[PDB]
Write a protein that binds this ligand. Structure first.
Ligand SMILES: CNC(=O)CN1CN(c2ccccc2)C2(CCN(C(=O)c3ccc4n[nH]cc4c3)CC2)C1=O
Length: 287
């Protein structure tokens, strides 16, 4: 529907396995947008993956999920258009802030963030996930690296895939197998390969941990990949030897207990996103 000639390409925002994303200016109904196009080395298989992503993205209509603003008309070279999220991925964003020392002592733009803003960030992710659940849409790779930050701490969940070198340490790779974000994965995912809304809740638990850590350390960071995979086996055997992420310094005990529930052995005992969102938006403000 959208004429490609109306785009003015400005800078490269990233590249993935089957496309790359550029910052563009538009003059028509200057707006900035993010535009995904085929890579220069695009193959028949990459174009197929691109077209399928267009179809997947057409499903997703929520304030806290990446939205498809437009696509280029059939004549033109393929493209997808979305909102420009000026503050980049959430992991880099939080890494550049520290928790405020005294409440409301700073100015806008300061490298500090409040505990209630951390809740606001996490609640938005929870709201996005709540939406995906109503679609029976399973994400499979929720993490702060896959969220984007706009103006005024607005958050949108994306899905970059697994090829950014910056996050290569977050994925476990074996020749001929799917690439796996094991440190964010529920035990039943690691052992049995099956991904559900309930395993997305588990990943949300780890993502919430990340947010409260201000992304200062990797989940299970002092443990090897092999040890993390063995931990899943300890969940299975249920002999009380499994281990969990520790309580972040910015996280009160009440919120941490909620976090722990996301990592329940039984999928059905993990809180739904509706419950997670309510806690983050309201209960977590309790003294
Ligand atoms: C929920 N599934 C998805 O979101 C899948 N999708 C679809 N999608 C997309 C991108 C453009 C147009 C249409 C769709 C992306 C968004 C994030 N990506 C970026 O490279 C990126 C980087 C910095 C940015 N700043 N502002 C916006 C930015 C975008 C990877 C591609 C993605 O993960």
């Amino acid at each position: 529907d959208f004429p490609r000639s109306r785009l003015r390409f400005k800078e490269k925002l990233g590249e993935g396995q089957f496309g790359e994303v550029h910052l563009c200016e538009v003059d028509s109904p200057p707006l900035l947008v993010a535009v995904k196009i085929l890579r220069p080395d695009a193959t028949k298989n990459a174009r197929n993956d691109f077209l399928k992503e267009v179809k997947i993205m057409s499903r997703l209509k929520d304030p806290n999920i990446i939205r498809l603003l437009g696509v280029c008309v059939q004549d033109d070279p393929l493209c997808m258009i979305t909102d420009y999220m000026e503050n980049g991925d959430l992991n880099q964003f939080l890494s550049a802030h520290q928790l405020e020392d005294k409440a409301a002592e700073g100015a806008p733009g300061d490298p500090t963030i409040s505990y209630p803003m951390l809740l606001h960030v996490a609640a938005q992710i929870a709201s996005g996930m709540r939406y995906l659940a109503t679609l029976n849409f399973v994400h499979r790779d929720l993490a702060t690296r896959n969220c984007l930050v706009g103006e005024n701490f607005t958050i949108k969940i994306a899905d970059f895939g697994m090829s950014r070198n910056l996050y290569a340490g977050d994925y476990y790779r074996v020749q001929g197998r799917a690439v796996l974000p094991i440190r964010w994965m529920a035990w039943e995912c690691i052992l049995m390969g099956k991904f559900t809304t309930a395993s997305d809740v588990w990943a949300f638990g780890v993502t919430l941990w990340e947010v409260l850590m201000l992304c200062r350390a990797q989940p299970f960071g002092q443990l090897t990949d092999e040890q993390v995979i063995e931990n899943a086996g300890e969940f299975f055997r249920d002999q009380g030897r499994q281990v969990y992420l520790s309580r972040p310094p910015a996280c009160p005990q009440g919120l941490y207990e909620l976090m722990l529930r996301c990592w329940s052995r039984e999928s059905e005992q993990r809180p739904p996103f509706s419950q997670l969102h309510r806690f983050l938006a309201e209960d977590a403000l309790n003294t």
